[PDB]
Amino acid sequence: KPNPTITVFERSPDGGRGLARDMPVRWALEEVGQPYHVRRLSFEAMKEASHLAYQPFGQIPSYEQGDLILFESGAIVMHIAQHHSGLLPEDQLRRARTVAWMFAALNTIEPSILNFTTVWLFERNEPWHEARLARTKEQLLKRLDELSAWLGDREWLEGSFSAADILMICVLRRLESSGILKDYGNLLAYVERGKARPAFKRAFDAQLAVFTA
Amino acid sequence: KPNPTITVFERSPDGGRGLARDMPVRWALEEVGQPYHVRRLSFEAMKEASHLAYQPFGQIPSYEQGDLILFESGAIVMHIAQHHSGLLPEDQLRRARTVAWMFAALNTIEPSILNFTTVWLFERNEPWHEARLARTKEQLLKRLDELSAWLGDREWLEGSFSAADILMICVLRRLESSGILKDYGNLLAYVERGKARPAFKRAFDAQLAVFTA
Ligand SMILES: N[C@@H](CCC(=O)N[C@@H](CSCc1ccc([N+](=O)[O-])cc1)C(=O)NCC(=O)O)C(=O)O
Ligand SMILES: N[C@@H](CCC(=O)N[C@@H](CSCc1ccc([N+](=O)[O-])cc1)C(=O)NCC(=O)O)C(=O)O
């Protein structure tokens, strides 16, 4: 069985902080102990027609393994989790709820974060910057209130560590620079619990090596 | 085996057009021939602490079947598709690609649409409305260019009709009122192909009956 190959930025705009969407894929591969390879793409290469055969929207990551080509970080993590052990529970009820939280990370929490970080980072010096910022921030804090209340004292989202936690923690890490998570003690601790796992460190060190290459 | 129950708006803000996120769930249930029930929620009821036991962010839809409670329209469709026939292919490679397109509908196409419709509908009379509109519209047209080029002459996204088409068509329908799809002949035809299916009509008539009740 051939190791998979994933596409990643040659020069990531994240400063080596492991915030690009290859990170949850790398982390999933490390959790299941699957060796993998990367193909580094320049910004120009990502826009070439050849890359569209791998990712139809000219983005990263894609995943190639033999005849299989996949895209969507969420779907790539799903595929890894479906064919190895340790990222999805065996019990069918628990599994279905784990998949709910995978979708929630990407389709409920992520949009609230990105609506905020887009205004915060990309739209300064064109008002009402601070005004649009205040609105998206209010909606974000409401979603974090909801997530925090639901999580309570749980170690992970659905019993044992899962693919949902990989996706949710990588999404929440987009808030590290803002300091917003300091106001949500259990969410901060949750993110730190994930970052302390050895597979997280192996994935993080690998994206950092691409950055410092 | 008990029929599932899904939560829906008592008075949907969509004018009976079947654009709320219960629609893809209803459509999936109708495609697999699973009878189901609905629980209608007032806007006030959706905000009560009791609803949080079903949907932690106070939104619809949720899905209840015996001991199983799920949320996330994408994950609910996934669950339906995993335990019935006709929405996911049996071949493992084709199945993985179908899941990629389910995620793409919600995590690549949907955000580009919603970034546009949010400005277009919710942010008039606070400039630079037309300016922010132009920016989100440009990003949307680029994603539609990409989706259209990839689809080509395919009947459906991954061979046979699938859960990916349910999610993608319901997302694309948020553009009907804008007329934008008229400029993408194959995408328009794709949406119409889905809307012509008898299960789509059964789902649509049911949400309309809640509206006209
Ligand atoms: N839905 C897709 C979305 C993929 C995507 O957004 N890819 C981005 C990279 S991750 C998003 C990202 C970018 C930058 C940072 N950062 O911290 O600098 C973090 C995350 C990309 O290729 N962008 C280049 C382009 O659009 O041309 C998925 O989840 O796989
Ligand atoms: N990620 C979740 C998102 C759920 C969600 O956004 N639910 C919305 C309804 S569908 C979104 C929607 C709303 C309105 C129209 N419309 O046409 O009027 C279409 C779609 C909701 O409950 N909103 C009420 C609230 O936030 O208080 C999922 O996919 O299930």
Residue numbers in the entry:
A (entry chain A), B (entry chain A): 14 to 226
Kindly provide excerpts from the paper associated with this entry.
Glutathione transferases (GSTs; EC 2.5.1.18) are phase II detoxification enzymes that metabolize a wide range of hydrophobic toxic compounds by catalyzing the conjugation of glutathione (GSH) to the hydrophilic centre of the toxic substances. In the present study, we report the kinetic characterization and crystal structure determination of Atu3701 protein from A. tumefaciens. Sequence and structural analysis indicate that Atu3701 defines a novel GST class distinct from other previously characterized GSTs. AtuGSTH1-1 exhibits wide substrate specificity although analysis of the catalytic efficiency (kcat/Km) suggests that hydroperoxides may be its ‘natural’ substrates, indicating that the enzyme may play important role in counteracting oxidative stress conditions.
The structure of AtuGSTH1-1 exhibits the characteristic overall fold of GSTs that comprises an N-terminal thioredoxin-like domain and a C-terminal all α-helical domain. Close inspection shows that the formation of the dimer follows the ‘lock-and-key’ mode that is also found in the phi, alpha, mu and pi classes of GSTs. A molecule of Nb-GSH was found bound in the active site of AtuGSTH1-1. The glutathione portion of Nb-GSH is located in a region formed by the beginning of helices H1 and H4 and part of the β-turn between H3 and β3. In contrast to other GSTs where the H-site involves C-terminal domain residues, interactions in AtuGSTH1-1 are mainly provided by Arg187 and the long turn between strand β1 and helix H1 (residues 25–33). Analysis of the structure of AtuGSTH1-1 showed the absence of any functional side-chain (Ser, Tyr, Cys) in hydrogen bond distance with the cysteinyl moiety of the bound Nb-GSH. Indeed, the Arg34Ala mutant was inactive (kcat approximately 0.01 min−1), indicating that Arg34 may represent an important catalytic residue. In the AtuGSTH1-1/Nb-GSH complex, the conserved residues Arg34, Glu85, Ser86, Gln68 and Asn120' appear to form the proposed electron-sharing network. Arg34 in AtuGSTH1-1 occupies two alternative positions and exhibits high crystallographic temperature factors, indicating significant flexibility. In particular, in one conformation its guanidium group interacts with the γ-glutamyl carboxylate of GSH forming an electrostatic interaction, while in the second conformation with the sulfur atom of Nb-GSH (3.4 Å), the water molecules W117 and W304, and the backbone carbonyl group of bound Nb-GSH.
